[PDB]
Ligand binder design. Sequence first.
Ligand code: HEM
Length: 153
Amino acid sequence: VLSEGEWQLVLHVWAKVEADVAGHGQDILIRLFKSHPETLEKFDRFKHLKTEAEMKASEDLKKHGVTVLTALGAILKKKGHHEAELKPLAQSHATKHKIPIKYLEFISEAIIHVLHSRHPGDFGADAQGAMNKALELFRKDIAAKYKELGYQG
Ligand code: HEM
């Protein structure tokens, strides 16, 4: 579990992400796509984008970045009591989108990378550690749902 103090660190940086959800969403997905190109293959909707400039110009990509960060934010704000929000997400990702747990680890790394770039002052080592723990709790809870359904990873 995270402590109250670690949750505070997480939500404090998150409040900053909220100031520009679209810009953060975009940078996160692009980082994911460039670092792990196999991830882009899971999106029929974005597969035609070849360059970072084409990605940056895509308004639909920016819209999806907002969707992703919006769902993540609702999870974080529950501070671990996220069963209702997590359940539907795990089911679509496992059964409909077919996203391995490892890709969830890759997007976690992209979030951390971006947060680092845009929020140095609010994103020191202590905050980075808390954010990591929160994202691991998220992945651990999702992984359990996947296991139940027969997709473990
Ligand atoms: C931070 C972790 C993630 C969050 C919170 C998240 C959230 C969402 C949401 C809220 C949706 C739309 C509703 C739905 O279908 O459930 C969605 C759709 C989808 N997600 Fe995720 N997602 C995450 C990770 C990923 C990653 C790692 C991938 C691929 C590598 C993935 C691929 C998909 C695809 C393929 C769709 C359908 C997009 C479309 O065509 O409309 N997601 N995601």
